[PDB]
Amino acid sequence: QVKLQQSGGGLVKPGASLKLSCVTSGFTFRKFGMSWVRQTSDKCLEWVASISTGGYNTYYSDNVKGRFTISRENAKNTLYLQMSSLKSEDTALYYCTRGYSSTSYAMDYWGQGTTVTVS
Amino acid sequence: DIELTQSPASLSVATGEKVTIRCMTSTDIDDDMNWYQQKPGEPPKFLISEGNTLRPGVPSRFSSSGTGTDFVFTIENTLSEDVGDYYCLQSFNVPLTFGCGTKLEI
């Protein structure tokens, strides 16, 4: 019933930008924190960024600080990841994720994954 | 930056046998260990959350234990449908960090 619907992404050249969307349904979106985590070809998972219920607190991996921005629009039930200054190292399947509790970003529901390739 | 290391990197069991997978952390995580199962072409599925508790709907043959820096995940009576990659995740501190999976075959 909870659904995280992803879109955006694609293949871009180094230095390019990309904005990923994650539209949610099935729950009161503003009561939950959300994150983006990415999976590389080696199948390892790496947390990218997290955002609190209202958007007042955001957290980023050192790998994307200064280049990526996580934001949300609660009235539209949508989570975003604005990527800029992209590099080949950012190539991954990006997942939209919901923090399972009012205190944890540990993920319960995941979107289907958005491919971004930087080449 | 808490690092998580899983073991074994992969294993093959026969149906009905027990599997034991471990995930150790570089520092204490207040028992905020989480376990996921991922099948090909799907996102990781949440099996176990913080406080070693099975998610509702997950088969009782799955369990987890451990505290401090030393955590374990087990499948008693493994079935063919349990083939996949199993991942641990600490959610005590940001950056949230994952082990890089244990591959399971039957």
Partner: peptide, 10 residues
């Protein structure tokens, strides 16, 4: 609030 982050704002 727990650990070093907040997920629910006030």
């Amino acid at each position: 609030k727990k650990g070093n982050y907040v997920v629910t704002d006030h």
